[PDB]
Amino acid sequence: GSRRYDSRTTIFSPEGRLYQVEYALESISHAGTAIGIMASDGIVLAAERKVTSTLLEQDTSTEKLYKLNDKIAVAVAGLTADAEILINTARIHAQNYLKTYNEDIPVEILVRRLSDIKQGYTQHGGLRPFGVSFIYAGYDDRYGYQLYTSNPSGNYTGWKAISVGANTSAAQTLLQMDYKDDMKVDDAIELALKTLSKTTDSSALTYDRLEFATIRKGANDGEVYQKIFKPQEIKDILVKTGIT
Amino acid sequence: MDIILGIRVQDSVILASSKAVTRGISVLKDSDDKTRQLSPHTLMSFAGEAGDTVQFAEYIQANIQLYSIREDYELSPQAVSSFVRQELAKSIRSRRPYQVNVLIGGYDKKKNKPELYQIDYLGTKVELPYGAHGYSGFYTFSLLDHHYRPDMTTEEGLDLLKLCVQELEKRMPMDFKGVIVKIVDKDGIRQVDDFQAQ
Amino acid sequence: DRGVSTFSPEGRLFQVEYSLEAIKLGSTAIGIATKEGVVLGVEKRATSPLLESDSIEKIVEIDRHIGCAMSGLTADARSMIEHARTAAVTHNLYYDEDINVESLTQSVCDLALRFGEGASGEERLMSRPFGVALLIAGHDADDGYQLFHAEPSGTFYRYNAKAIGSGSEGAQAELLNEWHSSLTLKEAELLVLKILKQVMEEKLDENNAQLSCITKQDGFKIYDNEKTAELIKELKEKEAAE
Amino acid sequence: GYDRALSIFSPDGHIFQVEYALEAVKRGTCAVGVKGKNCVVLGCERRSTLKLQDTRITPSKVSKIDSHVVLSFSGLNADSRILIEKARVEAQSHRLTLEDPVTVEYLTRYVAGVQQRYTQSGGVRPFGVSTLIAGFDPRDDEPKLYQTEPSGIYSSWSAQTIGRNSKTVREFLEKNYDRKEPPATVEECVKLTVRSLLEVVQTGAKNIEITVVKPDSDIVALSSEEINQYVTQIEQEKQEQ
Amino acid sequence: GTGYDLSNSVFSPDGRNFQVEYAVKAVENGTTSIGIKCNDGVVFAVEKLITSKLLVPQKNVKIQVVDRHIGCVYSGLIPDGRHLVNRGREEAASFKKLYKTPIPIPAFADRLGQYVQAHTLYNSVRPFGVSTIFGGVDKNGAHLYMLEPSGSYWGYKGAATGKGRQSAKAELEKLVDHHPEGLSAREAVKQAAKIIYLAHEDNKEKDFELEISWCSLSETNGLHKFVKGDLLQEAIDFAQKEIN
Amino acid sequence: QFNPYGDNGGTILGIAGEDFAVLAGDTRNITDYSINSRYEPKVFDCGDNIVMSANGFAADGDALVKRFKNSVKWYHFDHNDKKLSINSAARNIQHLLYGKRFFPYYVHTII
Amino acid sequence: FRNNYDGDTVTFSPTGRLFQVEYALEAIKQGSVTVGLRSNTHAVLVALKRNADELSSYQKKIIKCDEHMGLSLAGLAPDARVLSNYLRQQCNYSSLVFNRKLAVERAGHLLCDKAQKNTQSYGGRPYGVGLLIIGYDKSGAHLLEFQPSGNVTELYGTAIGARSQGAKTYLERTLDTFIKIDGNPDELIKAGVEAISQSLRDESLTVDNLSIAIVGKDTPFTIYDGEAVAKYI
Amino acid sequence: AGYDRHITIFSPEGRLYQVEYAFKATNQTNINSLAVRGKDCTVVISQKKVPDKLLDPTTVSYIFCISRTIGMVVNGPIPDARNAALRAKAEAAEFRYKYGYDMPCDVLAKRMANLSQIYTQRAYMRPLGVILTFVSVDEELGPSIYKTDPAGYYVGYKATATGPKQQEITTNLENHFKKSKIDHINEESWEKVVEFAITHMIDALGTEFSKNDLEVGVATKDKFFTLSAENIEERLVAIAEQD
Amino acid sequence: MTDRYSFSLTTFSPSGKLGQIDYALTAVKQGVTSLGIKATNGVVIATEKKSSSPLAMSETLSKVSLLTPDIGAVYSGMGPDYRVLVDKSRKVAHTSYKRIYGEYPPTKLLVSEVAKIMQEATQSGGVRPFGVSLLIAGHDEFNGFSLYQVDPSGSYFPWKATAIGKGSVAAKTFLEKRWNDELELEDAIHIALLTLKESVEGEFNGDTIELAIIGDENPDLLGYTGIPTDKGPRFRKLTSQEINDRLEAL
Fold this sequence. Notes:
The structure is cut from a larger assembly and holds nine protein chains of nine kinds.
Chain A: H1 19-28, E1 34-39, E2 42-48, E3 65-67, E4 72-78, H2 80-101, H3 107-123, E5 132-140, E6 144-150, E7 156-158, E8 161-164, H4 168-178, H5 185-199, E9 210-216, E10 225-228, H6 231-240
Antiparallel strand pairs in A: 1-2, 1-8, 2-9, 3-4, 4-5, 5-6, 6-7, 9-10
Helix pairs in contact in A: 2-3, 4-5
Chain E: H1 18-29, E1 33-38, E2 41-49, E3 64-66, E4 70-76, H2 78-99, H3 105-118, E5 130-138, E6 141-147, E7 153-155, E8 158-161, H4 165-178, H5 185-199, E9 208-216, E10 225-226, H6 230-242
Antiparallel strand pairs in E: 1-2, 1-8, 2-9, 3-4, 4-5, 5-6, 6-7, 9-10
Chain I: H1 19-30, E1 34-39, E2 42-48, E3 56-57, E4 65-68, E5 71-77, H2 79-101, H3 107-123, E6 132-140, E7 144-150, E8 156-158, E9 161-164, H4 168-178, H5 185-197, E10 209-214, E11 235-237, H6 240-247
Antiparallel strand pairs in I: 1-2, 1-9, 2-10, 4-5, 5-6, 6-7, 7-8, 10-11
Helix pairs in contact in I: 2-3
């Protein structure tokens, strides 16, 4: 029959571990490093582009930083195609909530729902898990600026500063070293770039290998603004922070 | 139909609901509470089809209570009313629609302002300083168009409702056996046990 | 791998046979049928002194005239009890009468082989057999007092006395000698208490052991700890007598 | 579509997938529950593999099923949410039909039933979660504490612990809990809870969280200071000897 | 490597389907049965091994009728043969319902052919453990067919399958050569009876029972009928005479 | 438009004695103003000492008696040849009749 | 060899065998002995009932399908319950739709076709029980032997189960005698009891151990157990 | 791991062995077939081998009439051949019903190739061990030869060959077209195009044919038909009066 | 019967690799070289028509396919896999866009739709990933000209210029030397023919080469007149003659 060829993706190891989850996490540990840092006046998302060429169009490119809501954005580490599947369902869930309650979806509710979908592929279906780790950057009028992270297991946690993908151990040590509770966005932007510049597997940290986004409540407005940095804007901030 | 009245004052929303339940020839009950508490600061009154009326109310109540526990948070009166509207908007195009008209009176703790929502069985939601369902509105709206101010105190609002009930007791054909009056403010929902002769 | 409804070269069902091994590890349950009623007794077997012993529910009521005891994977028995309770009440609704004990047992046993990954016979949606054996005991007007042993195999036997669980083979050999067609209810109660004491790892008291009976007059009743304690005291005295 | 029998019997009469689900519980952070004369207390340890979390938003270990019932767990966090959600839905459904909130036994029986179902259904693995369910029955003041496990087996405890080093903390509780005189105060109940956790947590003011459930929907979680005060007093009991 | 013979629909490195070839081994192990196409019809005959005296003679019928004009006989796993005839009957009824005319023999042949071939396409089903000899009279003459476990079938002058298929085929070949003008329905019944007795020598240890059926335009009005009584005994004697 | 129901007339009678019971019924079967049969049995022996007649629409009457007779047969199969008591037979028929609550057996039935 | 080709019923062996079917056939040989035999007026089932303990009951071996048909089992009892219940429906359907008693030969065809479906599809398993069907229809007395392989054979007499060969040899010898026991039920039953006792070894057939059924000309299928078989021991 | 050769999943080399072994099944019948285009016709020749004397040779065929206009010759086992034939017929009839015109040869080829591609991707469906050569005189493209394989591959041919000795026939035809400089057989009658096909069938295989060794199907404007033994005999007489 | 393969055939290995995707990429690597270059006023996609027989008609096999009147696609790897993807891509352009918004999808979104189809073949039960890499070139009003590469994993990235298949490594290197942000469409076609020559072993002409462009609107290829807003398709496949003319200026 068919049983012969069944990998059994949703079974426990003798130790009580989920094979496919563990192996999916191993897959992500090779993907470009993504960093999120939450400050008092906003949040910073930074991501290192894995594999680039001279002929790679960076202006029309987006592989790690995606807009879910007007208040919620994500940083991606792992399979881009798997991530886009989950991103689309998350974008729909946000709109379902807005249509139902006439209010924007609270960050955790959206995060939990995506994490629950990931958990599903972990317990039933016989399908492989999504080889994706998300860093959620979002704002709502309950908890303010929030930073979440989710992995193939379907587990999510909140952070002041976090990294996913490659060299997370080295990145987390550097973040835990220089992070302070009273930080400003501009300080966080710098911390994010410094941490990446030291964890990079490449020679130098150039603009063409980076994606940058900040979620700030521009004082001269009163509303939350999402800013996905353009190639030139990344090039500028890279010089100012003293990396050139 | 049963009498369903609502009035938003300065710091509270007051709901007045008739106590009578009539089936055909007989008045079966004269102490019926035509309301449900969806959350500590949100109250919903209802009138309509015999079975649908309570069934819909308890169904909505269950969903808001489930949300409250899941999030450890109370939805704003606007968010609850938008949820109720969508439920009725689904219902109207189903096999057997809920024939229930509702008034949602809630105090928004975030805005620190009272709110009153009127939604009919079709899913027609509107926010009002004062609202009524059925034939009640035909006598009451002109009364309230005349005597209503937005700065009125809760006591002024109770005097204003008394004036509405008196008009409904004079000109209405049905004996609705008086009303149960409830106040929704910053401190939650309480029942005025003394409206039989206030 | 290998199918869940695969035959062994000996003509046995692997999963059914392995299921019987799970029951062998379960807590001991003894049933004794008399012309005065059927007695059911179980070993509570608490895993820790902090475990509140009275929360161990291994003897359950199916109907006023039918009760049962479980041994093995006790969690598997819940849906079986649910099915039994429904089958009993449903029969009463359809026929204005009590369901025969044998008919109730057969209905429970009908679920047993309803396992597989797609066995061509009906829609057997259950990944494995039950990991629990049942001692269904009751009374009806047609066949009087009865004791049945329901297995995950689907087969059920009627016993005058039966022991299931860890100390089954030893307790069964004891029941073999001790049982006779003229036993009284009290004789059976003490006899369950005596044989449980023999096979139990712990010293039998009114906390790690539970008694119950089914009589035509009062139906199925679970003995409260105070009632059992006296029967234990009565048993110790009669043993020390000779 | 997928109905492959994952939880099956082995030659020795074991269901390895249920057995390995318990190993996931052994891996999970320690959780403890003790019932007093007028309250139940739930204690949970906090991991330290990574420290830089946001404690405000990070999902807490003790969850409210209803206003009167709480659920703590040990094992896979992702799996626990599915159990909590289903329990929370059943809580409201029971109130809607019976017109009376769930008893702690009933809520436990339901959660255990869901867990058991996943041990003999096609195409699903068992929950790698054991739970502690505590609270007070409607209009009742007698404390309730129950434990469930991947197999679907449940039972009530005077005091119980699950997770990593639950073996150690249970021993403490077995020789520190008297059924004759259960902690007759909320204070001495929380003290016995923190004491039992300190046997394993190894100096953890921020690594220990406590929740107190009293009769009539009176549930409150203790702050770091309130707990840290207990730790300070307990460390003195040792040094004063 | 190996293991190409464990699943049904798998091709082996030499383009074979081993499970089908394994099904043939079950056919070869079975009783011998034949089919003789005559000038205006077809004759079917089968060996019936008398296991013991307890078998009620003439009761355990093997030859089956499809519709009212088709006769089917098979060697191998008898239950599988019944399953195929059950399908063949449904298939014939479906044809008659829509087209009014009873199903033509070549039409009916393909209907069984496609159905048997279908059981070689998936690993969830087992190939048929029978070779079926069938045929009858339609709009334009008589037809004889033999169907293999592979789904393969052809039109035949004479057909044979089972234990003594070689002895039968040898006798069938002699008849084709010595009768280029065509055998008669009467003669084919006698000749079928002989071929069975001669092919029984590959199983001469156990006693057997003869069973003959025929479908002739002149003799049976083009309807399938069993050979019984005097005509059966006449054929039994014709064989018992030429066996010595 | 097609009317699934008809009226075959007839009348049935049941009287219970102290240790006996009778179930009578005329053998006339009709349609409008014509007689279909002068002898068409209406009262039946269903086994287990139970007599039954479902008078009204004959097609519904026959279908009900047939289904009850088959219910008695399966009662023996499922319950070790136990005798179906008259009280049990009645309750069984209630479920047979209420089973078609929204497309009723157009009959007055007496056992 | 065998180990690679006995995982499921959907697999043929290199020799063309179905081991899962053969394994199911082995469950019959492990089952308790039962005997069928017929004349021209009657058909008799004699079955040896097996008990677990001396405290247990002797599990029933004979099931009634209709007023004119019934069967005896050897192997898995729940599978015999499934197949007998299917046969009960087929006899029932024939009566309700056609006002016609189901022919014993046709009943055998239906059991054959149902057993076959469990021998060709994945996920399923062959039935683990042998059946001996007796019946009196429009063509007289009948006896059928059902095998899980799907093979159904009409016989004058036969036996299935453990040591069944003893009874089968006796009947093959007593053939000319019992076939003529017409109009005498007691003698046909005695001939069956003498048949079944040729398969004994452990004990001797007792009162609560013997099970006999009969059907015929003016005899509806009736089962005799206990006190009712005492006059045959 | 080693099951990458049992079902249609990629091997480490990026290969699909089940598709490759399905290709091997196409030669099981030991039959060679060729197709050539005339001026306004298309001719298929296929070897006919009837070993058993008990066979009715009139029923032994690997050429199928799919529609009034389309004909198909198969290389591979007959059960898979008839599976592909019935499907092609069903697809041809449906297309006409839905779209109001006769399904073109190249479209049926693509449709059958797409179906074959699905068995290449889906695990539960095995590839058919056959190669299908479709022929017709399309109302838009004229004489057409389109051939599909177990891989799901298909393409149009000026002429083609299939079977064990495919390469010998292919190179033979190649050399003729290198010489003639045209992509067809410049002949007005189909009879001579059939004769051409038989002639080069003989030259490439080095074997003489009787009337029962061959099998011919001819596609013309608005009709595809197969030749009888005597129609072929007439063709064999004509080629003999040249050599 | 019934597809009982409801489980994934692509799963994570201990190393974190997705075997079937890696092997699908290996199958791509064996495939014939195809390329794409983006100019300032157009995009060019080209491949070699590897005729598997001289008796076969290479015209009846298009390796370059039109998806929408402004979007074209080329591949490297398994031909049959590409063909069915083209059919699905053409349909999804209608069902998921044109039937809703009354206009053809922008290049990036159709690429995203194709990527989704290929992604699902990586996760869905009882299937293998597509053994192809695609190069999709298109134009839309708000994004201008763009070129994308879609891999078996479902991952897609935009390019200024790139090559896939056999000699991709060597071809990409040559493109890096010749590409600039000021290239005219004709210059890109010239570079395309140069890069492809190094990949072709045998005959190199308009019959062995398949080349198409995404440039200006072609009102002569529209099929009708009378609607001013409809100015024709931007996708145009170059004729065998049009290629040879540019090969003389090689």
